[PDB]
Amino acid sequence: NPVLSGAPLSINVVADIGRQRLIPSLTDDEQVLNRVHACRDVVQKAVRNNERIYGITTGFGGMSDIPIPPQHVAQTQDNLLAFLSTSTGASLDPRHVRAAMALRANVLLQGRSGVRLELIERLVEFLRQDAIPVVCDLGSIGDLVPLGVIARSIIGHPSTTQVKYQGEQADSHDVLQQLNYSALQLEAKEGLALVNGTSFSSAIAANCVFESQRLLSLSLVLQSIMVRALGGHPEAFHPFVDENKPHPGQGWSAQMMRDLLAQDRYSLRCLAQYFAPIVEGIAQISQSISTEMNAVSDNPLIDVDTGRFHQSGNFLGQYVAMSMDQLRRHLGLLAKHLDVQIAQLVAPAFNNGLPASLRGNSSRPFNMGLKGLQITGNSIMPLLTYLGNPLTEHFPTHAEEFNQNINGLSWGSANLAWRSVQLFQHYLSVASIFAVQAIDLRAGLEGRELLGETATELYETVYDLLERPFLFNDDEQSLEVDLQMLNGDLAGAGRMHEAVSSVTDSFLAEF
Amino acid sequence: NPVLSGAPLSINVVADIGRQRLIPSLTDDEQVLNRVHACRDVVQKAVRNNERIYGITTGFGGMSDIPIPPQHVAQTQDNLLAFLSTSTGASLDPRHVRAAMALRANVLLQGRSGVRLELIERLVEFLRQDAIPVVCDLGSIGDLVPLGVIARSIIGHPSTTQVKYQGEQADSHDVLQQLNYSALQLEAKEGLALVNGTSFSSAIAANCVFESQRLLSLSLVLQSIMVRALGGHPEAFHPFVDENKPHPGQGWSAQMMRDLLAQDRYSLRCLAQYFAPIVEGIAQISQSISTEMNAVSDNPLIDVDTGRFHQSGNFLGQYVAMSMDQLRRHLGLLAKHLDVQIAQLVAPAFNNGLPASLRGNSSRPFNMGLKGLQITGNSIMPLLTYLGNPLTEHFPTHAEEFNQNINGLSWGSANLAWRSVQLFQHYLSVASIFAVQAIDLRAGLEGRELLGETATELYETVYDLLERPFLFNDDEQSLEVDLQMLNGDLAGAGRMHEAVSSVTDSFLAEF
Amino acid sequence: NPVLSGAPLSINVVADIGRQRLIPSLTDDEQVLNRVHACRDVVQKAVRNNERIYGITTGFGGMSDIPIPPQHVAQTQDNLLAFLSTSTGASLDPRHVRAAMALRANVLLQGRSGVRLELIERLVEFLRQDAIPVVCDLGSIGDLVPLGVIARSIIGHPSTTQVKYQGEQADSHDVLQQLNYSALQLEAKEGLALVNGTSFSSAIAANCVFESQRLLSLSLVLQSIMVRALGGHPEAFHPFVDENKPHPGQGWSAQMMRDLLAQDRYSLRCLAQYFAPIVEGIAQISQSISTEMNAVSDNPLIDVDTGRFHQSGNFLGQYVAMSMDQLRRHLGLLAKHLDVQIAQLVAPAFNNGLPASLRGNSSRPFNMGLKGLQITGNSIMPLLTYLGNPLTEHFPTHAEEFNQNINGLSWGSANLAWRSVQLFQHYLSVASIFAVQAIDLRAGLEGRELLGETATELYETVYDLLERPFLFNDDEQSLEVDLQMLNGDLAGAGRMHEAVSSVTDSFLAEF
Amino acid sequence: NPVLSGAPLSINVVADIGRQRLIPSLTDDEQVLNRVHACRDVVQKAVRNNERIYGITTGFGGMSDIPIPPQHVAQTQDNLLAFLSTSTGASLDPRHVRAAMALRANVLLQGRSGVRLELIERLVEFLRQDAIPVVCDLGSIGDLVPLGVIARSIIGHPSTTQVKYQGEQADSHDVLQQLNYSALQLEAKEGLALVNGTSFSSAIAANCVFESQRLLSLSLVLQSIMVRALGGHPEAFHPFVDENKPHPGQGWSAQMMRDLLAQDRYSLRCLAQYFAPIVEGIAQISQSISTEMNAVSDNPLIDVDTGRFHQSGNFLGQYVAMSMDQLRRHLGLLAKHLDVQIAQLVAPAFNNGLPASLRGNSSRPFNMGLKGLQITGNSIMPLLTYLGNPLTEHFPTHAEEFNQNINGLSWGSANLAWRSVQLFQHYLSVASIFAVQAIDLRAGLEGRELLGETATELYETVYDLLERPFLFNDDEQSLEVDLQMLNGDLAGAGRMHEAVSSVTDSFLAEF
């Protein structure tokens, strides 16, 4: 189980904390906790001497021109959480909320935010007890409102939130009492330090990146299966070809295709070249999101080695917004390449001998094997391609009394990226059924006998998930049940992700 | 209660059937039912003489080159529903499914599809009993799969669907038994006639249009309230101005503003000119969607006056796709105009004397009235503007074995339009709170005393929904609860829609 | 030759004035000129009594808070043209500038702007003498700067412009002297009245609409030729099909296809349904642009029947912006349908017997007939589809000291629409070559013998323009020369537009 | 002067060759030319033994199923250039054509394409003699047609092209004769090897990247000037802030701002955070484009160390397409940040004491200093933001007889990126005038006295280019002339690029 100490976290660990596959533990390192205490001491000394500092003794973003008298300082922080209670929309996936809580505790543990250690302890204990606040998906432009939901949940703020605990949704006060916590009154800068960052956007983005790495690996393995089913020529992946076009993505993709496996059409012959920018872009986005989520995004940065306060703009999530736009583009391009490959697989003009629509039985003249499934794929893929459009360009320049004239919209972009992830999971269920049926039909014409180890493992995982050519007569099964099973696996246990884990590990090691 | 007889339906009636505010009844007119029987007789005669007709005796779209022997004809139809069982994704709003069932029954009642009357009766009775099939949002490119869910539900097809009945979700077979229906075996062309149309896309679009008309009226009334709160000059809406720029939308919008109410900024002074294209476009989309949803979209069109079969492309939903793209644009532009007006309302540089962020109490120096609420609006509006991008342009040209090389993606476009409707409902809750607070503060500086009858009615409805200036101290309420109340009203009972019903009726009468 | 009197103009007349096929003449009607004189008298009376009126005695948009003393009133107008001299970018097509001059003179002739008649006379005389100011394509958000170029040109303002006259580009002062005009000093409100409107955006939009109507007709005729070349079944256009889906666009398109001419693929069988929304949208855009360009867009509207000044927002070009976005969408969809049809025509899997890539000679084994031409079409079409994205949504809310917080960007949208028109002209040259070659090859397998009157006329026009199956050996011609000839015809004399003039007239009569 | 030997070239050298600031020279290295000769020998041996190889003895992409007899082999290559003569549209900037010729010669010099050395010599000599073929901007989906123009120009192909030489445009045959070259008949694979790559797309992209690096540096310096003019607090760029958010772009941007120079608004306080993703993305695009342009993109790759032929997909320009989409996004975001900063600079609510619209003289009450200039900027910026939309997603899957079902559209994307570059050059002229005027007014309130060395150098360069606060009375100059001067400098000599060369060098050294 990971230890939270302010040290950088990997996207893998963040996603596993979000997935409840890892239980975070608070650090016992003396240096980290001493730095946190010293930061709180700097805040205390600034309050005691009535030093003029933004947030502590002034108003907030657009109304920072209004001074706050000392006796109201603490109240100001509480009042912050009162006016940030404007969270609406559909409820977020609790994985995002768990990841955000872990990331925020890790950020606060670096000793630049001036929080009390007890707030970090409450965050970590809520995460360990699986008392996860319900957070809705509207309210941030890139994170006062979504993070304010978590802050109000963990301090027992009178602006009651909803917290899921022990499988039931309850009031934040009830969950607080069940955790033997009392209501907490915020000290100076604490309420601002809990919400003035990019942790929630970074958490959604980290989940998107983890899923996208796994989905890229699964897409590549399904592509290898489809290429084998089409009888594609491995000549497209000879080392000489990528040696003369040394894009790292192309080299890694060609090496993967070599491991997994007059001229073919481009979707087969130019596969590594098509993959190269997607692979490299996903790697770049992974690195940038990992850098952002491990940064201290609080605005008043406290340096305890000098005892100074620094104005900051580290709460701006422009990088997360642009990275999520790019990630949506990558998912759309992967989906479109898979759709082109499937269109090749279903059409006898391009089948190279496969039955039309990959029908399993020729004896029933009215069998239409995977025609409706192809229509489902054709309905899903353009949604991903459409989500390839960028949201960052539409950012409001009038936001928050014209004070936040650049924001970024990393929150909306990350939620769109998660929508893309869900759509691509459904699409990959469709593509998995297409790949398995196509390879079975190809084996019959000449399934596991045609496939390498990783592709065989994925094929067997798909066969076992569906409890089983794959499809023989149209009336012998319901493809809806199979699609639900594969999608639930991709969203849940991830046996298909385990089946292609060698490719994912290769991508992580290379990039 | 409406009578379904194949006569054209209004979008209002379709939406009220979807909303369970109207219970459809099957017609007892002898001519309509006799035409349905004669159409089925034409199908029977074509089957008896083994006439070669698409769908009845041939394969389906991409595999229509394969003939079907007579003894399998009926089986083919059943088999259709077997291979179209590929519905996945998030579950649709049951309003869409009710509207689709009503529209499909109405289309089949026109006597061009060759169905048995008992299928129409089962559709109508499922609608009357409130046994609504669960339909997911992926699978159509503009409606075999989503309509196939309904067909399988009402005939008790072995590809089991999920049906919501008496408040509980059950298997289609259980609901069928509870309705005292037996399993039904499809005759020739019946399965194709149930699913080969645009009824589901048209139903989602009709719900979107109904909501968008109401939301346009509410937006206009909220704009009038905000203009009054800013102290805007009514000179912008003098009859002479629209008389010299005779866009119908501009004239109607200026007349509405006149009823509801050196130079102002453009968001106030050019309000009618800004509204004009939105008003006229919404009217055009209403008319086109109403035309599409009342059309016979079945491919083999049977003329009983001549007993002929006509090949058709009326199942293509290109018009619905483009209209929904335009409607999303209109909602985005309304949201952006409201956001600009709110940015004016919160900034003292443009307030014309209103407090910063519309704070209610100046005695508490740390009050930040609606700053977080403005941030929430700034997070919602760009999502609508982004959804202004068109989906129709991304349509797949390789779809369904390259046979459906033009499709349209009306299904995806309509689901995006409904997403826009939900986002704009949340946004209008935000804007309603902003309008009420701003008008209260303006009244204090100089609420209902400043407003006309319709605006006063909307203001009082908002006050009563929230059980109540509107906001005085930040800690005296939670704006999340108010936003939830207003959004639930807009999505549910629609008391705010009733408060502005005069404007909606004026729009319907004019356009 | 048209007479300009302030009466509404048709888009046809505006485009022909822009094309120099019509020479405008100033009206001699006593009522119109008397109204213009009375409007100028109202302005004079307002100046004499030092009445406080926006523009005349105040500052301009964002600086209207600054009063202007009477002795500087006239200077203010001149100074306006000094600070609006910020036109940059690529030079506009002179057709746009001619159309804008005609439209502005027509708008001023309605007697609401308070200009001297001599300014209107100078505009008309510059248009008649073909002394056309050079106007660049950047500077307007929807028309101070582009219209200011024309105003400075016709009054001899010290901010010198460039004017094309007698085939040579010269300084505005030189052209003024050659026209025997002296420098003109602006009176009150005159400089503002010359530039404070949507006339230039409306002129570009009117040219786009004229071209788009002609291009829609040409697209439909080329589609009929391609459908005949594929051996498509006319059953798709039977009156019964559109009778049961009564979209006006579908009915008109099916009637046109009937005149011009198991199941076909959708690009043929659903052609009328695909066209319907494009036809109706083009008609709607035509009507809205015609309404906008004939409106008085000046801000201070003077009513001479009451002698009053009215504040206006009629200078806002939101409708033009949205209509041009929609028109770009329509052109993109037409191009994509044509590209799908061409992809059908070149592939022997879908040719129905035509040679691969429409090669003319089978004896030369290395002939690749229209492969490069298809690649050219595939490079052009996605540019049009991409231009289907809307620009209006990106409008700046901070524009002009935050005073123009809603603008529209009709100028940029209209220039994008003209870019779409040019791209689609190139694309239609490509499609014309494809259609002619395909129909010749189809005739050989079973050109003018297969075609109706309008299609035969277009085929013969294409044959005569290229001085001539159409292509036999690859080395016997250069397709670049043919593409240049067809594109120059579409951009210039329009013999191909004359060949399909019956369809264009039918569209105008119906819509 | 650079030596072309097949070794990788820098984007700087490619752009300077395109700009005629460097004259390429062909290598005299024995190993490189010997490898080229050996590659041609491998091709000769394959032809002599009638070995079946794609391109040499088969048909081309979609028609490669058709064998070619030996006697026609050479003719096939010539015939290729005949059917690829389908180049249309607007003429490209000759910089792109020079860069493409240099890049293609460099690619062929690597000895994998099997060309004769004389073809490379003709390419290099055409480049050295400044005989540049006229190439139009339509015809490629990512480069047969645009590269075929160059090939036909340098070999004197009967499909005549237009070549600019000695300042005059002439027929390719005339220029060939003036260069003392005779017509050249292509040997096997040579015509395919000249055109089957990404060199032209890579050349346009390399020019875009060079310009974008310079424009990023200029944008950063102009931002520093505007921040100084607003009186922004340098606290936003303290090393502690970027130390705690270690994005490399943020660190480099903050270091640059430190060198060049209750809370500020975000456009000032979050400037480094906003820049970070743009800086890093521009660096990534530079690296990827440099990798692509130095790769061997020919399809039949010949290995002379083994004498083998390898099928390749290295002609696919997906990476160039996606990189150019991202670069357009980066330019749009830079433009929007500058527009937000200018909106701050012109509004007295946010000026911090500057005159409204940056008017120079308060004595003339009707002076509107840079209002029209701000409108021009507001018209340019949304075009760049709109061009931030991606084109790659719209790629045609039916292209070239469905054989090129994935292409990329790198050609269209790169041409769009160059359009963005031109728009941003115009925009930066506008922003330079705004910065100079603002800093002069700030100096008057408290220009070169407020600026560091690089900013002073840029300010003095702008003052010298315009021959000169900067603007005092509106009628004392024409801003159009100044904008033309600054834009011509940015497009031509680049004195403003020299003034900020330290920042560009810092960016190159860091990234």
Burial of C182 (0-12, 13-18, 19+ CB in 10 A): exposed
Candidate from B349, B402, B405 with C-beta closest to D349: B349
Q: How many Å lie between the alpha carbon of C288 and the closest alpha carbon of chain D? A: 23
Asked whether the CA dihedral B21, B27, B32, B37 is positive or negative, the reply is: positive
Resolution to one decimal, Å: 2.2
Whether B136 and B258 map to the same domain: the answer is no
Which of B214, B282, B217, B91 is CA-nearest to residue B490?
A: B214
Which of A94, A91, A111 is CA-nearest to residue A102?
A: A94
Question: CA distances (Å), C89 to each of C144, C146, C199, D385, in order?
Answer: 16, 11, 19, 17
Domain of B109 in residue numbering reads as: 3-196
Asked if C405 lies within 8 A of A394 by C-beta distance, the reply is: no
Whether B138 and B208 map to the same domain: the answer is no
Which of B141, A323, C383, A405 is CA-nearest to residue D389?
A: C383
Asked if B144 lies within 8 A of A347 by C-beta distance, the reply is: no
Any chains having at least 3 CB pairs less than 8 A from chain B are: A, C, D
Q: Which of residues 421-440 of A touch B (CB under 8 A)?
A: 423, 426, 429-430
d(CA A276, CA D48): 37
Q: How many Å lie between the alpha carbon of B346 and the closest alpha carbon of chain A? A: 6
Using an 8 Å CB-CB cutoff, list chain D residues near A329.
322, 325, 390, 392-393
Q: Tell me, what amino acid is at D201?
A: S
Using an 8 Å CB-CB cutoff, list chain D residues near B405.
398
User: How much is the CA Rg of chain B, to the nearest whole Å?
Assistant: 26
d(CA B74, CA D58): 50
Candidate from A159, A372, A396 with C-beta closest to B144: A372
Using an 8 Å CB-CB cutoff, list chain A residues near D308.
240
d(CA B434, CA A401): 14
In a domain, A16, yes or no: yes
Q: How many Å lie between the alpha carbon of C397 and the closest alpha carbon of chain A? A: 7
Burial of A494 (0-12, 13-18, 19+ CB in 10 A): middle
d(CA A483, CA A474): 15
- Partners of D92 in the β-ladder: none
Do A103 and A9 contact (CB within 8 A), yes or no? Answer: yes
Which of A393, A310, A141, A188 is CA-nearest to residue D269?
A: A310
Whether C210 and C190 map to the same domain: the answer is no
Strands A132-133 and A162-165: antiparallel
- Could you give the angle at the alpha carbon of B6 between the alpha carbons of B3 and B8, nearest 5°? 85
Asked if A393 lies within 8 A of C397 by C-beta distance, the reply is: no
A274 touching D (Cβ < 8 Å):
yes
Residue of A nearest to B345 (CA): A401
- Partners of A133 in the β-ladder: A163
Domain end point (choices C163, C196, C229) = C196
Number of helical H runs and strand E runs in chain B? 21, 9
Whether D234 and D132 map to the same domain: the answer is no
Asked if C394 lies within 8 A of A394 by C-beta distance, the reply is: yes
d(CA B145, CA B128): 23
CA A433 to mean position of chain CA atoms:
25
Q: How many Å lie between the alpha carbon of D492 and the closest alpha carbon of chain A? A: 30
Tokens for A316, please give them: 């701006």
Candidate from B347, B349, B398 with C-beta closest to D397: B398
Tokens for C360, please give them: 């003319």
- Partners of B26 in the β-ladder: B4
Asked if A313 lies within 8 A of D267 by C-beta distance, the reply is: no
Tell me if residue D31 falls in helix, strand or coil.
Answer: helix
Any chains having at least 3 CB pairs less than 8 A from chain D are: A, B, C
Domain end point (choices B196, B224, B251) = B196
In a domain, A348, yes or no: yes
Using an 8 Å CB-CB cutoff, list chain C residues near D421.
none
Tokens for D268, please give them: 């000032």
Could you give the maximum distance between any two Cα atoms of chain D, in Å? 90
Using an 8 Å CB-CB cutoff, list chain A residues near C349.
347, 349-350
DSSP assignments along C232-267, one per residue: --GGGG-HHHHHTS--HHHHHHHHHHHHH-----HH
d(CA D278, CA D326): 9
Using an 8 Å CB-CB cutoff, list chain C residues near A405.
398
Using an 8 Å CB-CB cutoff, list chain C residues near D417.
none
Do C291 and C313 contact (CB within 8 A), yes or no? Answer: no
Whether C237 and C178 map to the same domain: the answer is no
d(CA A21, CA A494): 12
B402 touching A (Cβ < 8 Å):
yes
In a domain, A44, yes or no: yes
Other Cβ atoms within 10 Å of A184 Cβ, number: 18
Asked if C405 lies within 8 A of A398 by C-beta distance, the reply is: yes
Whether A433 and A409 map to the same domain: the answer is yes
B345 touching A (Cβ < 8 Å):
no
What is the interface size between C and D, counted as CB pairs within 8 Å?
Answer: 281
| Alpha-carbon dihedral D397, D402, D408, D414, rounded to 10 degrees | -110
Which helix or strand (DSSP H or E) is residue B137 part of?
A: strand B136-138
D8 touching B (Cβ < 8 Å):
no
d(CA C117, CA C104): 13
Q: Please, how many CA atoms are within 13 Å of residue D241, restricted to the half-sphere of its CB?
A: 29
Report the CATH number that the domain containing residue A73 is assigned in CATH. Answer: 1.10.275.10
d(CA C47, CA A3): 79
B262 touching D (Cβ < 8 Å):
no
Do B276 and B246 contact (CB within 8 A), yes or no? Answer: no
In a domain, C459, yes or no: yes
Whether A339 and A433 map to the same domain: the answer is yes
Residue of C nearest to D367 (CA): C79
Domain end point (choices D179, D196, D213) = D196
Asked if A403 lies within 8 A of D246 by C-beta distance, the reply is: no
A3 touching B (Cβ < 8 Å):
no
d(CA C375, CA C387): 19
Asked if D266 lies within 8 A of A350 by C-beta distance, the reply is: no
d(CA D243, CA D252): 11
A351 touching B (Cβ < 8 Å):
no
Using an 8 Å CB-CB cutoff, list chain B residues near A61.
371
Catalytic residue, candidates B54, B181, B274, B319: B54
DSSP assignments along A248-317, one per residue: HHHHHHHHHHHHH-----HHHHTHHHHHHHHHHHHHHHHHHHHHHHTS---SSEEETTTTEEE---TT--
Question: CA distances (Å), D37 to each of A57, A241, B92, D31, D45, in order?
Answer: 78, 21, 67, 10, 12
Using a CB cutoff of 8 Å and minimum separation of 24, what contacts does D42-48 make? Answer: D42/D114, D42/D302, D42/D304, D42/D307, D42/D309, D43/D114, D43/D187, D43/D188, D43/D189, D43/D302, D44/D187, D44/D188, D45/D307, D46/D188, D46/D309, D47/D73, D47/D187, D47/D188
B509 touching D (Cβ < 8 Å):
no
Q: Tell me, what amino acid is at D248?
A: P
Which of C131, C37, C8, C150 is CA-nearest to residue C87?
A: C150
Using an 8 Å CB-CB cutoff, list chain C residues near B393.
329, 332-333, 336, 385, 388
d(CA D115, CA D56): 12
Whether B64 and B154 map to the same domain: the answer is yes
In a mutational test of the A interface, the residue from D247, D384, D405 whose CB has the highest number of chain A CBs within 10 Å is: D405
Asked whether the CA dihedral B482, B488, B493, B497 is positive or negative, the reply is: positive
Using an 8 Å CB-CB cutoff, list chain C residues near A398.
397-398, 405
Tokens for C370, please give them: 């229209």
Q: How many Å lie between the alpha carbon of C279 and the closest alpha carbon of chain A? A: 25
C241 touching D (Cβ < 8 Å):
no
Question: CA distances (Å), D215 to each of A461, C374, D81, D416, D463, in order?
Answer: 52, 37, 38, 16, 19
d(CA D43, CA D473): 72
B160 touching C (Cβ < 8 Å):
no
Whether C155 and C231 map to the same domain: the answer is no
Asked if C269 lies within 8 A of B240 by C-beta distance, the reply is: no
Q: How many domains does the structure of chain C reveal? A: 2
CA A43 to mean position of chain CA atoms:
34
- Contacting residues for C305 by C-beta, under 8 A, at least 6 apart: none
Q: Please, how many CA atoms are within 13 Å of residue C229, restricted to the half-sphere of its CB?
A: 35
Asked if A277 lies within 8 A of D314 by C-beta distance, the reply is: no
To which residue do tokens 């491990």 refer?
Answer: A294
Which of D131, D120, D121 is CA-nearest to residue D178?
A: D131
Whether A113 and A255 map to the same domain: the answer is no
d(CA C60, CA C63): 5
C93 touching D (Cβ < 8 Å):
no
Whether A272 and A394 map to the same domain: the answer is yes
Asked if A313 lies within 8 A of D266 by C-beta distance, the reply is: yes
Q: How many Å lie between the alpha carbon of B169 and the closest alpha carbon of chain D? A: 40
Other Cβ atoms within 10 Å of C492 Cβ, number: 9
Candidate from C245, C271, C349 with C-beta closest to B295: C245
Residue length of chain D: 511
Tokens for B348, please give them: 């003292």
d(CA D172, CA D157): 8
A67 touching B (Cβ < 8 Å):
yes
Question: CA distances (Å), A217 to each of A284, A331, A491, in order?
Answer: 16, 12, 15
Residue length of chain C: 511
D313 touching A (Cβ < 8 Å):
yes
Tokens for D404, please give them: 């090129």
Q: How many Å lie between the alpha carbon of B165 and the closest alpha carbon of chain C? A: 34
Q: Tell me, what amino acid is at B333?
A: L
Q: How many Å lie between the alpha carbon of A405 and the closest alpha carbon of chain D? A: 6
Q: Tell me, what amino acid is at B402?
A: F
DSSP assignments along A28-95, one per residue: --HHHHHHHHHHHHHHHHHHHTT---TTTTB--STTTTSB--GGGHHHHHHHHHHHT---EEEEPPHH
Which helix or strand (DSSP H or E) is residue B90 part of?
A: strand B88-91
Number of helical H runs and strand E runs in chain C? 21, 9
Using an 8 Å CB-CB cutoff, list chain C residues near A346.
none
DSSP structure class, residue B353: S
Q: How was this structure determined?
A: cryo-EM
Exposure string of C6-22, with b = 16+ CB inside 10 Å and e = fewer, is: beebbbbbbbbbbbeeb
Burial of A65 (0-12, 13-18, 19+ CB in 10 A): exposed
C107: left (phi over 0), alpha (psi -120 to 50) or beta: alpha
- Contacting residues for D178 by C-beta, under 8 A, at least 6 apart: D131, D165, D166, D170
d(CA D280, CA D278): 6
Other Cβ atoms within 10 Å of A23 Cβ, number: 14
Tokens for B177, please give them: 């038994």
Question: CA distances (Å), B391 to each of B77, B211, B324, B472, in order?
Answer: 32, 21, 9, 44
Report the CATH number that the domain containing residue A360 is assigned in CATH. Answer: 1.20.200.10
Do C334 and C424 contact (CB within 8 A), yes or no? Answer: yes
Whether D215 and D172 map to the same domain: the answer is no
- Could you give the angle at the alpha carbon of D321 between the alpha carbons of D319 and D323, nearest 5°? 65
Asked whether the CA dihedral B248, B249, B254, B259 is positive or negative, the reply is: positive
To which residue do tokens 């939620």 refer?
Answer: A415
Tokens for D220, please give them: 């950063």
